[PDB]
Structure formats: C-alpha cells, structure tokens
Design a protein around this ligand. Structure first.
Ligand SMILES: C=CC[C@@H]1/C=C(\C)C[C@H](C)C[C@H](OC)[C@H]2O[C@@](O)(C(=O)C(=O)N3CCCC[C@H]3C(=O)O[C@H](/C(C)=C/[C@@H]3CC[C@@H](O)[C@H](OC)C3)[C@H](C)[C@@H](O)CC1=O)[C@H](C)C[C@@H]2OC
Length: 102
C-alpha cells in the first residue's frame, strides 16, 4: 500500500545508517531518534542520495551503495570519510511532505 511516492521537490523524513566498506559505522540518525529532513533532487545532499531515492513509498527501506564520484570524491569529508571512499547507506522513508496547493 503506497498512495504517494517520492518525487523531485518532495520533503522527505528519513532514518539512516552510514557505513564504510570495512563495515564500520560512521553516522546514524537512530540513536538520537531524530529523522533527517531534506528536499529531494535539489542538490541539498550528495548525488547518490538524490539519484537513489526516487519512487519510494513510506515504510520502504533501501540499501544504497554509493561510489565516491557520487559521494565526497577525492577530498572526502574528514574525519569520518576518507577520500575515494565507497559509502553504504541503509535508509528508511518515514514521511513525505509535499506542497499540494499552488
Ligand atoms: C553547517 C553544518 C553542515 C550541515 C549539517 C547538518 C544539517 C546536519 C546533518 C544531520 C548532517 C550530518 O551531521 C550530523 C552529517 O551527515 C553525514 O555523517 C552523512 O551521513 C552524510 O554523508 N549525509 C547525511 C545524510 C544525507 C546524505 C549525506 C549528506 O548529503 O549530507 C549533506 C552534505 C554533507 C552535503 C555536502 C554539501 C557540500 C557539497 O559540496 C558536498 O559534496 C557534494 C555535499 C548535509 C546533510 C548538508 O546538506 C548539510 C550540512 O552538511 C556526513 C558525512 C557529515 C554530516 O555533517 C557534516
């Protein structure tokens, strides 16, 4: 059951856990139980998120495996992310907030 699914310009509420290749976890929203909120497809987030999160239903989970060209490239994001790194995100969509009227 999925009456609405994510499209560009939607505001998404998401839980995530990010891991590096060696399985070590570098960030997660679950411990503080505070979902991350962003607008899809506006360039607010790394490309691998904007491209990997379309057509999603609330309640759906996805595993994203993001190569560094779609992530933080050659400079990375010190201290948690080295340059050239592949990122693994496990994500869950909690809510779609979509501007309905004009
Ligand atoms: C002034 C404070 C900064 C401001 C911080 C917040 C609102 C708090 C928010 C929870 C972020 C987290 O803070 C605990 C933390 O999330 C990470 O741990 C992480 O899991 C991650 O990779 N995420 C977060 C979840 C969405 C995907 C990705 C991201 O796209 O993040 C986005 C990101 C960094 C995009 C850059 C922007 C510049 C481009 O040039 C670059 O390159 C294209 C891509 C984040 C959300 C930015 O929009 C907003 C911010 O950065 C980063 C490893 C480090 C990051 O803190 C820095």
């Amino acid at each position: 059951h999925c009456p609405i699914k994510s499209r560009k310009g939607d505001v998404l509420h998401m839980h995530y856990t990010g891991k590096l290749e060696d399985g070590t976890e570098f960030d997660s929203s679950l411990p503080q139980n505070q979902p991350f909120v962003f607008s899809l497809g506006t360039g607010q987030v790394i490309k691998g998120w904007d491209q990997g999160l379309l057509g999603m239903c609330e309640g759906e989970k996805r595993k994203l495996v993001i190569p560094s060209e779609l992530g933080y490239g050659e400079r990375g994001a010190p201290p948690k992310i080295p340059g050239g790194a592949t990122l693994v995100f496990e994500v869950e969509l909690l809510k779609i907030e979509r501007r309905t009227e004009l």
